[PDB]
């Protein structure tokens, strides 16, 4: 399909995407905190030695600076691949992302843009990350027209989606699920390939219920589908959303028209979470097909706790229980 592959974990797939980018795009640079020695999650190992200190370099410890600086590089047309060390620390840059990067093209009438900016950042829970190593900030960004927000579920998916973000002519935030960085490897093409943005993937066809998630939570719902089949004889259609905005409304609505039931799950808190946008849209488009209320199985509306993590996360049992109730509605 895509030429020679090798087994890669998710951090290795990110390095491969970045390597491929720097090799084919002489403008491209990578920068942020501690990227020069390879990064705190090893995603940039070897790249400075290979491409040069002017192309893979450390910034001062200042997130608002990192994003501002990246926007300026992109204004000149050069590819700017910024790192924010944990997604929890993206908030100092919120003004540069929301007021500047997202609005740059619109407000100038397309005289200027920062389309060649990508911001990548580790994301999601990790077992013990507590309040500031665990967050899933995608719903904060979903309300900002002019940026794209993309989240992969695996090494193969990560490299193809990240290459798409780097090449896309719009500022992109790419969230890397950190609990997958050294999880199982899979085969990943060594050469560049792209997976389209704003396109969901039906990874398992089903007839009774649609399940939607992204990131690590795709694996949870995949297991929920298995539990529902074995324990309930229920056939689940499992969808990875992949791009948060602009999202693939059509694929989700087509699925729900077929199944008549939808359960959306994410690690982020329930209130104002992105499940609310999917639920409200699907209700609008698929109203007459809905056999049961759309269910959202999300993190609680609290900060992300340390010792309590096993009780906080929308795990397979929480998803399964909600599904059982929805099937019985």
């Amino acid at each position: 399909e895509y030429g020679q592959t090798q087994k890669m974990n998710l951090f290795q797939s990110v390095t491969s995407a970045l390597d491929n980018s720097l090799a084919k795009d002489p403008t491209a640079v990578i920068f942020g905190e501690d990227v020069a020695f390879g990064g705190v999650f090893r995603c940039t190992v070897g790249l400075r030695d290979k491409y040069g200190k002017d192309r893979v370099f450390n910034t001062p410890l200042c997130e608002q600076g990192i994003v501002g600086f990246g926007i300026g590089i992109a204004v000149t047309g050069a590819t700017a691949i910024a790192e924010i060390q944990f997604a929890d620390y993206i908030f100092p840059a919120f003004d540069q992302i929301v007021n500047e990067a997202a609005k740059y093209r619109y407000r100038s009438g397309d005289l200027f843009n920062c389309g060649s900016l990508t911001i990548r950042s580790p994301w999601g829970c990790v077992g013990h990350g507590a309040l500031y190593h665990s967050q899933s900030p995608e719903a904060f960004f979903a309300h900002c027209p002019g940026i794209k927000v993309v989240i992969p579920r695996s090494p193969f998916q990560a490299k193809g989606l990240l290459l798409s973000c780097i090449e896309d002519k719009n500022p992109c935030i790419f969230f890397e699920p950190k609990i997958l960085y050294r999880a199982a490897a899979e085969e990943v093409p060594i050469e560049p390939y792209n997976i389209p943005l704003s396109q969901a993937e039906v990874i398992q066809e089903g007839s009774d219920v649609t399940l939607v998630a992204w990131g690590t939570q795709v694996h949870v719902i995949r297991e929920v589908a298995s539990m529902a089949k074995e324990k309930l004889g229920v056939s689940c259609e499992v969808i990875d959303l992949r791009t948060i905005i602009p999202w693939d409304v059509d694929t989700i609505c087509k699925s729900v028209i077929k199944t008549g039931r939808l359960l959306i799950s994410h690690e982020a808190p329930l209130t104002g979470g992105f499940a609310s946008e999917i639920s409200s849209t699907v209700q609008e488009e698929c109203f007459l097909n809905l056999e049961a209320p759309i269910s959202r199985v999300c993190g609680y509306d609290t900060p992300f706790p340390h010792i309590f993590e096993p009780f906080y996360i929308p795990d397979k049992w929480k998803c399964y229980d909600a599904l059982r109730k929805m099937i019985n509605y």
Binding site: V29, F69, V75, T76, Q96, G109, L111, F112, N170
Partner: protein, 369 residues
């Protein structure tokens, strides 16, 4: 001492370092208030044609300010920011740049565009949001931008352009084509976190950038006594390792000299420079007029004739700008992303359907169709 964080001797006595704020960094001046050159070795001896261009750019800006400020008082345009007191800082610094040096700024930088021959029609088009506006009428007035003249579109959030200008300077350094970036901001905006980000990044990443701070003593109602307590903005530069100077912003020649030298060294050395130009919230136009008279390069008749000609050119652009239609309302949806997402196109189609039915309730009259 053997500490990696600083290069310094030991001292065996406890002594706090005191800021020198009472006698701060001195203010560089080339000509006095009567337009006389103070120190001949500092005179740039700019040719007559160039100095007349400086003068006519400042005065034409001032003519336009008077008219658009009145337009705003009448509600003909929704908003306006004048350039009074800032004509010298902007025209003097712009003249010291190469035409292709990239400019970032905010609300006081129209003189840079005027010096770069930005058409009066296009200043007007942006303030009216009319069909000629390349910004498509989407931003409030005076949010100018020009790709052809390398002037990055202004945005309202203060200081956001500062770390951006540093990133564009880094990219320029890598591109290796002898270009500088200049970044303008006020002394109020310098309090923002993004100023600290941009000053530090420019030093550690060795960027060919001029930071140009205009210090007029006030940010809206806030005097500088409530804005900072060090020796203005110039005294901050050395703390970041940035070469720094303070100049008399009512003196176009002092502004020009400092900008010319900062540009020369920034490009050659890949290092940032900070210029703080002191202004008032003794005017740059008066001072330069006195200079012209001493050279025999201007007189009352020429002054009268140019006042008339410049008023005529501004009024011609003004009347034309007012009579142009606004852009098609469809343009509210394009350029959000480069492409239009299908869901956004659905919203555009919904507006088109809405106007088909309820259009009588909308000002469709002076919008393009």
């Amino acid at each position: 001492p053997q500490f990696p964080g600083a290069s310094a001797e030991f001292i065996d006595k406890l002594e706090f370092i005191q800021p020198n704020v009472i006698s701060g960094i001195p203010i560089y001046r080339v000509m006095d208030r009567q337009g006389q050159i103070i120190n001949p070795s500092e005179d740039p001896h700019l040719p007559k044609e160039k100095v007349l261009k400086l003068y006519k750019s400042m005065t034409l800006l001032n003519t336009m300010d008077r008219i658009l400020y009145e337009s705003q008082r009448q509600g003909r345009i929704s908003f306006y920011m004048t350039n009074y007191g800032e004509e010298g800082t902007h025209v003097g610094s712009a003249a010291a740049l190469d035409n292709t040096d990239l400019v970032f700024g905010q609300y006081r930088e129209a003189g840079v565009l005027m010096y770069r021959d930005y058409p009066l029609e296009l200043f007007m088009a942006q303030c009216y949001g009319n069909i000629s506006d390349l910004g498509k009428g989407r931003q409030m007035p005076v949010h100018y931008g020009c790709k052809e003249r390398h002037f990055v579109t202004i945005s309202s959030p203060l200081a956001t352009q500062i770390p951006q200008a540093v990133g564009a300077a880094y990219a320029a350094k890598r591109a290796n084509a002898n270009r500088v970036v200049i970044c303008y901001f006020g002394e109020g905006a310098a309090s923002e976190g993004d100023a600290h980000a941009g000053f530090n990044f420019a030093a550690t990443l060795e960027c060919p950038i001029i930071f140009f701070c205009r210090n007029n003593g006030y940010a809206i109602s806030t005097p500088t006594s409530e804005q900072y307590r060090g020796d203005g903005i110039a005294a901050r530069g050395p703390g970041y390792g940035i070469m720094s100077i303070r100049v008399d912003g009512n003196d176009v020649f002092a502004v020009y000299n400092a900008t010319k030298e900062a540009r020369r060294r920034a490009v050659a050395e890949n290092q940032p420079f900070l210029i703080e130009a002191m202004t008032y919230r003794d005017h740059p136009i008066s001072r330069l007029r006195h200079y012209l008279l001493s050279q025999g390069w201007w007189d009352e008749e020429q002054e009268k004739a140019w006042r008339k000609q410049s008023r005529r050119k501004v009024m011609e652009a003004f009347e034309q700008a007012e009579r142009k239609p606004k852009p098609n309302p469809n343009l509210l949806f394009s350029d959000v992303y480069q492409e239009m997402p299908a869901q956004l196109r659905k919203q555009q189609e919904s507006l088109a359907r809405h106007l088909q039915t309820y259009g009588e309730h909308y000002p469709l009259d002076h919008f393009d169709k």
